[PDB]
Amino acid sequence: MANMHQLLTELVNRGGSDLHLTTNSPPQIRIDGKLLPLDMPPLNAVDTKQLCYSILTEQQKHKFEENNELDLSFGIKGLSRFRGNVFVQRGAVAGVFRVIPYKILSFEELGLPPVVRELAEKPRGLVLVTGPTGSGKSTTLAAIIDKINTDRHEHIVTVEDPIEYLHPHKSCVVNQREVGADTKSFKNALKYILRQDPDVVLVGELRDLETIEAALTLAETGHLCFATLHTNSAVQTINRIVDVFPSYQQPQVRAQLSFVLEGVLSQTLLPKASGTGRVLAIEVMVPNPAIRNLIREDKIHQIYSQMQVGQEKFGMMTMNQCLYGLLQKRHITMDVGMGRSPDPDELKQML
Amino acid sequence: MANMHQLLTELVNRGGSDLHLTTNSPPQIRIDGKLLPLDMPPLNAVDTKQLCYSILTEQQKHKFEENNELDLSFGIKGLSRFRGNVFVQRGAVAGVFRVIPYKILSFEELGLPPVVRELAEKPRGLVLVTGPTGSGKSTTLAAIIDKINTDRHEHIVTVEDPIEYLHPHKSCVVNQREVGADTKSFKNALKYILRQDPDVVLVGELRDLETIEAALTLAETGHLCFATLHTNSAVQTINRIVDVFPSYQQPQVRAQLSFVLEGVLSQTLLPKASGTGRVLAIEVMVPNPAIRNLIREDKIHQIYSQMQVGQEKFGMMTMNQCLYGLLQKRHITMDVGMGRSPDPDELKQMLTS
Amino acid sequence: MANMHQLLTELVNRGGSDLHLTTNSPPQIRIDGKLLPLDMPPLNAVDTKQLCYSILTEQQKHKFEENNELDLSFGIKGLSRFRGNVFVQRGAVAGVFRVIPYKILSFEELGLPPVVRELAEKPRGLVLVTGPTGSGKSTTLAAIIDKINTDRHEHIVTVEDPIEYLHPHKSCVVNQREVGADTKSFKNALKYILRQDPDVVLVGELRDLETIEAALTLAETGHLCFATLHTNSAVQTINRIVDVFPSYQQPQVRAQLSFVLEGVLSQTLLPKASGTGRVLAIEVMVPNPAIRNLIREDKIHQIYSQMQVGQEKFGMMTMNQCLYGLLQKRHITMDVGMGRSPDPDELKQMLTS
Amino acid sequence: MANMHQLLTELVNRGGSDLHLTTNSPPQIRIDGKLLPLDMPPLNAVDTKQLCYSILTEQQKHKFEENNELDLSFGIKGLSRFRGNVFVQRGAVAGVFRVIPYKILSFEELGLPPVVRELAEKPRGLVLVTGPTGSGKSTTLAAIIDKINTDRHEHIVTVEDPIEYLHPHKSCVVNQREVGADTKSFKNALKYILRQDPDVVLVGELRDLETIEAALTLAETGHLCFATLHTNSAVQTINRIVDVFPSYQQPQVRAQLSFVLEGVLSQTLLPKASGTGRVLAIEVMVPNPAIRNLIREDKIHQIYSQMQVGQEKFGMMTMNQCLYGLLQKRHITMDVGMGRSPDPDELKQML
Amino acid sequence: MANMHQLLTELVNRGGSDLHLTTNSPPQIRIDGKLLPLDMPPLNAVDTKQLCYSILTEQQKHKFEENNELDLSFGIKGLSRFRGNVFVQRGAVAGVFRVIPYKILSFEELGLPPVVRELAEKPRGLVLVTGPTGSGKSTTLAAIIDKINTDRHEHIVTVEDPIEYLHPHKSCVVNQREVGADTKSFKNALKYILRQDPDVVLVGELRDLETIEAALTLAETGHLCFATLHTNSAVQTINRIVDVFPSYQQPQVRAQLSFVLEGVLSQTLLPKASGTGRVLAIEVMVPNPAIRNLIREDKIHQIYSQMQVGQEKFGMMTMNQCLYGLLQKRHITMDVGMGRSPDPDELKQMLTS
């Protein structure tokens, strides 16, 4: 019982990030990116199985034994929230546990410019946050929804695979449903959400077509809808979105984007020059009337240049321009910025 | 249970729209679209479970425990009907309950000009009431229902997602079909609606093209067809309808709409300057021969201008002109109108003039 | 039982066109378009269930309870046939019933020009009668059936969902298959139709490509093929038909249609100017060498010009030209004609005359 | 029992073509295209059901009662074979019955040129007979397979939906399997045909993709395969065949046609000038080295002209050229030929 | 039981590389590539079934009987690991078993240049080790695993079908998942892999696009991704990888690969010139600025020229250049080199030297 609690206590006390439990090794804690083994006996398959199973219900036990894998989250009051993954290797239980602070940092602490914060007060429209998995997206969503929770008296609903942040009540009522335990699926949750009087929705991963169509319909009916994609830029995102539709409907898609878009974000994480932590590099596209005209003229091969030159007028910023700023502030190195720049020649031109 | 009646009583008495029940929050009531928490202790899991379980049958207990979800509606005699949804979040039961009023407001009471009333007397054509969710569309439509029911000897059929307003019979026969219970889909209702000898049809949301084609056939077969859309302006509405079809088919669709369309209304509830209640600002486009020709000629980009100048001739009215009247009447503030105006410069021209 | 029969007796006696049965209203009947309630108590769910169930089979009981929808037809000997539609509202059964006379009117009684009568004698080709649902198409089809039945010793087969007009034997042998009872589907009927030695075939609605391919093969092989569309004009019909094929296969289909097509009709029903009865307006296209060439030349944009000039030569007539004739004879008003004209300015020019 | 026998006896004796049985009409026979009722009482549902059911087995009864439809064939020894269809109308049984002579007419009786007869001796390759349903195709197949049966000592297998001609033994052993009674499906028959030592195969309708691929593979391995299509011409047939393949594989298709094709037929039936019977109009494409080069050059927009001009050299003949010959011999009228010609302007040019 | 153990004891003692068990032959062992039967009776189906079944679980019993195929690995303590393949012939079980040493050889023992050792220290990027099945890829991968395990305090995860090399803990924590036992599939493992805090990941075969997308995301986000292909050269590898994406999406993938790729290896195993043992021939591609530009310029046709000139600058080496070095050292014959050279004339030109 009180051993897993002690391991998590040591992780926090030691300023650790992650706990690893697997057979034939002592428990190990990743500190500042590097693993350190604890001065403890090695776990056997009995140890790992007993430890992970001791904090699960018989429902979770049944489903885990049905699939031999399980993602979950749990909290230790006054300590932290945690994301857990349990799996099997060499016929024995293994586990990885990430810890999750109770306090969500602000846009300023995250290096996010004020326009995203002013976007968090928008009552309708389409906001896209893109980038690969684990690029700080969930942190951004928690900060934005805490801002709305603090400032509005509205209804926020989240659907989660699992919950990555707990949002107790500020000025909004926020309900958070975990997929796989509380509800059978995203689809079942979406079958009832319109009868639950929502205003703002967190939908989790954009898993399939039907969910995209449901969310877009929801989005055009006067709600603020947040969703994620695994695209890495605004241009790549728009191309991905247009090319999924039939050719005859791309004009309509061109019309839809022209009507509903209020902001496009695409974010990535770069190693800090300090060696501890990661820093956000972000491309921002905000449609202006000029861009809406470019949309009307059927030119996507010139939108990237418009976002490249809308910095002073509209606050736009390419990924390379953000990397340039990070280099000027010495948060990242020149080599890393060039190795991750989607167009090194353009940065050379700017220099 | 015995306090639940009082919770619904507080919701009704305060004129609230929705009751929200969840643990670690007091009950919260939506008033004029915005939540206000009540001065009560937060609910715990025992409270929420006992309250939600108090209105379920044992078969409902089985079904709720099977799915952790339930949509339902129920009535409390002498009070109101309600649509309830019960679900589970954070491992605990939560619930949201919307009210279903017995009383329909009138056209005059809503601040709607007489032209909507004259449009409700049209024997045929297409009439659209659009806008965001909760902008009064279902209430407005239900009022037109009751007006026709009172004044005409015709046939009322509704196709609904879910059923909202309940219409007993006045001078019409009224049959009401709820999607997902009474009929499999909007599509199935349209598959059988023409064999029911209708005069008046409620189709719910114009969710896709196939229903639009059905509506054009309905409009051309001698009926007055009502449907809803979630657009925020007349131009956006027409563009959305045309752009759904392939480019090569837009000419015939534009001609059909130009022929059968008799009115498009797009309405929005705005916060009152007093801070209590909301008022509808609504733009109305009624086609004249010139407008029908421009629709036929594929020149969307100037129809707004005809509405901008069709005030004196045809009783047309842009959203900004309605907002102008509300501002002159001090119903709303200048900043709110400018904040929602799709063209603040036009409002400035109208104001300085 | 004998109560529905008595209600139907009152329906016939009063010249009514439809019986409506639904809860919380007494049965109501349409006389000259307007409903009148019978002096009876309002129905409840028990009443509607017993009345609607009295004309269903046990498999129909299972089926209605399986789908909550049912279109059907049935006959009462010595009185009339009826088309029924059953649905559900407020959790209870509801029904609408239209009546079906034993005697089919002739072409001349309907005001149809002599060319349709000459068309009933065609040995081969494709004949299309189009218009929306309940626009009088089936009555025209039944008249053509009766003309062939009277004059030829050939085999007429109909496939219907449901069977509407009943045709007993005159000079032909007539086999009529109802989808869902006599045959599993239109597709299943078409799988076996070539082994039934037909000369003339009724296929019901042209809902998809596969039936179209069956009909084109029949029409090319020396058979008379009848089909319906819900289109409102010749140009709209041809465009709808062409655009369903792949672009690479559009040439062959254009050639087939250009070869086998012998007539396309598109109906509409308008209220008579007197305020009693309805009058048929029909656009008729009979291919001439110029139109067949236009098909070969890929100049569909020019068919309208051929339709504009084919009145005297081929007996063709646009919808506006038929409405024009109804207008000169004062059968319809200017407002109905203009509100229905696909080109009101053209109708204006004709109204110069 | 002896009544259906008498009805069929009257049909033959009276030179009839088809027997019709339905309720509320006496039995009717189609003679020279026109129906005539017999001087008999009208049938009721009991009559039609009893008559059609009296010649069916319990398994046919079970299947018909399961589907309310049935195609079948049967023979009356010393009289004829028959194709039957039973269905339901007005809640009552109805039936149509076509009669089928025991003796198949020859190519010259059918007006078929000698090259098809020389083609019937080919050991391998691809032969296509196309046209709409009931265009005399089954009659052509029966004549060709009787020619092979007479001349070869090989194994002929037919798969039928139903059998349209019985082929008792001449010089070959011929086995005929009826789909829906003897075997579950075409697919089940095809699963075992290679273990049945066949040389020549009749496959029935080319109903699906998988069957086409199975038949083409069979046809490439040294067998003579006969199949049908509902196309109306050689060019339309080749276009139909090519466009079903992926675009990247059309070169291969171009290569296969260049390798395996030995003949393409497309046939239709026109009313004879006398008013009795139908006459065959046929388009014939036989690949020559020049055509194989046109295949190599990727020109399908010139193959029709090569078949139009390969008449004297290779014996080719367009549908219009056949209609021309039918017109000079006065078998069909000029109006019917023009109303049926796929290109009336080409026939004009020839005139 | 102790008989299979004794057979395996003889296998180890005689330096054999595989044990074969099948009916109607005694067990036969490969010594220096050639089979020799043991002095035992020929096996029957009972013998093969008992021997092969002795190492299966009841799960595995049901599974082998369900599929008649099984690849697997298992260990015998203090002796060796083994890779097994089980199949069926003449209605009886048959098996082939390859053996797996406890000690993994180093890069230098294998004749691998220092750049692979420098590659094992890379903090991020994409490293590909390719070649056909059983071409020595897994041995190289195990050596890289052992190098990282020895030098880093990081998390290595392998996903294998089946687990081949066993890696105990050195400085890393190693978790190894066998498809079909530890995890349902590669896809299911990839669904959960991001929640397992990896630094280095082994994903098994790159069989389809979805795993490729997972690997590209990992390689772009600061992780070390290892994957395999059955390609034989760098150009063949890049073309195979590029051509699976849609043409419109090929630009992004080209950019991703150009950014994240740090090395591509392609192996082959050749018989040694002495007639004993096998020697590794490997083509190595390390992207330089010119190759990354060639990717950006869409000039893949010029990568071969970059491969032709990148020996001195980047330590690159074509397969022929490695075979050339083996030829100058007389490690392989001219016939094997020419019969394996992708360009024998080039190899001839080098053999001028």
Tab-separated table of N, CA and C in Angstrom, chain A residues 153-154 169 173 175-177 182-183 192 195-197 220-222 248 252 255, chain B residues 18 24-25 34-35 67-69 85 88-90 96 132-133 230 243-244 246:
chain	number	residue	atom	x	y	z
A	153	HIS	N	-19.392	32.522	-16.922
A	153	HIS	CA	-20.400	31.715	-16.242
A	153	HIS	C	-21.109	30.811	-17.245
A	154	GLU	N	-20.371	29.841	-17.780
A	154	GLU	CA	-20.850	28.998	-18.869
A	154	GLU	C	-20.574	27.541	-18.521
A	169	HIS	N	-14.275	23.724	-9.962
A	169	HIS	CA	-15.116	24.839	-10.370
A	169	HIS	C	-14.485	26.178	-10.027
A	173	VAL	N	-19.376	25.797	-14.472
A	173	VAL	CA	-19.513	24.381	-14.154
A	173	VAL	C	-18.842	23.596	-15.269
A	175	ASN	N	-17.744	19.778	-16.442
A	175	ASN	CA	-17.890	18.333	-16.301
A	175	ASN	C	-16.908	17.611	-17.202
A	176	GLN	N	-16.206	16.633	-16.628
A	176	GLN	CA	-15.166	15.889	-17.320
A	176	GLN	C	-15.463	14.397	-17.274
A	177	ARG	N	-15.611	13.819	-18.456
A	177	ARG	CA	-15.990	12.436	-18.684
A	177	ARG	C	-14.809	11.666	-19.241
A	182	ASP	N	-16.314	6.009	-17.653
A	182	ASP	CA	-17.581	6.698	-17.454
A	182	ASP	C	-18.518	6.513	-18.641
A	183	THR	N	-17.974	6.463	-19.856
A	183	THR	CA	-18.773	6.312	-21.063
A	183	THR	C	-18.082	5.348	-22.015
A	192	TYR	N	-25.321	12.381	-26.530
A	192	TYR	CA	-26.067	13.048	-25.480
A	192	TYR	C	-25.619	14.475	-25.167
A	195	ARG	N	-28.089	17.420	-25.308
A	195	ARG	CA	-29.120	17.434	-24.290
A	195	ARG	C	-28.549	17.794	-22.928
A	196	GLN	N	-27.264	18.171	-22.868
A	196	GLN	CA	-26.591	18.533	-21.629
A	196	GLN	C	-26.282	20.030	-21.555
A	197	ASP	N	-26.920	20.838	-22.401
A	197	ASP	CA	-26.794	22.292	-22.393
A	197	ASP	C	-25.366	22.850	-22.351
A	220	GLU	N	-20.380	25.287	-35.681
A	220	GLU	CA	-21.060	26.312	-36.456
A	220	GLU	C	-22.373	26.734	-35.813
A	221	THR	N	-22.839	26.003	-34.800
A	221	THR	CA	-24.070	26.306	-34.089
A	221	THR	C	-23.856	27.254	-32.909
A	222	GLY	N	-22.746	27.990	-32.880
A	222	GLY	CA	-22.530	29.002	-31.866
A	222	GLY	C	-21.684	28.639	-30.665
A	248	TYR	N	-15.244	17.986	-55.434
A	248	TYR	CA	-16.363	18.860	-55.747
A	248	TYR	C	-16.746	19.700	-54.544
A	252	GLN	N	-16.579	24.340	-51.275
A	252	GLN	CA	-17.363	24.538	-50.066
A	252	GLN	C	-16.441	24.578	-48.869
A	255	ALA	N	-15.076	27.756	-48.922
A	255	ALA	CA	-16.068	28.663	-48.371
A	255	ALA	C	-16.166	28.534	-46.850
B	18	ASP	N	-32.149	26.393	-17.842
B	18	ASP	CA	-31.567	25.080	-17.600
B	18	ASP	C	-31.091	24.966	-16.164
B	24	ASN	N	-19.675	19.089	-5.986
B	24	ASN	CA	-18.693	20.117	-5.662
B	24	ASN	C	-19.055	21.475	-6.243
B	25	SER	N	-20.261	21.629	-6.769
B	25	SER	CA	-20.802	22.897	-7.209
B	25	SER	C	-22.207	22.998	-6.646
B	34	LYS	N	-27.009	32.619	-19.310
B	34	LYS	CA	-25.817	32.631	-18.468
B	34	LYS	C	-26.087	31.979	-17.116
B	35	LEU	N	-25.124	31.198	-16.625
B	35	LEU	CA	-25.285	30.481	-15.362
B	35	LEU	C	-25.098	31.334	-14.114
B	67	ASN	N	-25.676	1.775	-19.459
B	67	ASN	CA	-25.070	2.711	-20.400
B	67	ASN	C	-24.464	3.947	-19.759
B	68	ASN	N	-24.804	4.262	-18.510
B	68	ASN	CA	-24.384	5.501	-17.855
B	68	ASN	C	-24.861	6.752	-18.606
B	69	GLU	N	-25.885	6.622	-19.443
B	69	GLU	CA	-26.489	7.744	-20.136
B	69	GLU	C	-27.984	7.533	-20.243
B	85	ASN	N	-31.422	15.026	-19.109
B	85	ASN	CA	-30.337	14.118	-19.423
B	85	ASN	C	-29.545	13.818	-18.167
B	88	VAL	N	-22.772	10.425	-16.340
B	88	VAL	CA	-21.765	10.261	-15.298
B	88	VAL	C	-20.488	10.959	-15.740
B	89	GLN	N	-19.907	11.738	-14.835
B	89	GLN	CA	-18.632	12.401	-15.046
B	89	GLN	C	-17.907	12.402	-13.712
B	90	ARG	N	-16.574	12.416	-13.770
B	90	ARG	CA	-15.700	12.247	-12.597
B	90	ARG	C	-16.124	11.055	-11.735
B	96	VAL	N	-28.429	17.405	-16.346
B	96	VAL	CA	-28.836	18.693	-16.885
B	96	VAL	C	-30.291	18.585	-17.298
B	132	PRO	N	-27.934	31.330	-34.399
B	132	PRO	CA	-27.283	30.390	-33.487
B	132	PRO	C	-28.280	29.690	-32.579
B	133	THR	N	-27.751	28.695	-31.880
B	133	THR	CA	-28.515	27.932	-30.907
B	133	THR	C	-29.078	28.819	-29.812
B	230	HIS	N	-28.187	27.495	-39.028
B	230	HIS	CA	-27.335	28.162	-38.054
B	230	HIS	C	-26.477	29.302	-38.610
B	243	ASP	N	-23.384	26.873	-52.185
B	243	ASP	CA	-22.071	26.251	-52.240
B	243	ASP	C	-22.087	24.790	-51.820
B	244	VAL	N	-23.196	24.283	-51.278
B	244	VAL	CA	-23.225	22.863	-50.962
B	244	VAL	C	-23.237	22.065	-52.252
B	246	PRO	N	-22.442	21.034	-56.281
B	246	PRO	CA	-21.331	21.205	-57.220
B	246	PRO	C	-21.548	22.418	-58.108
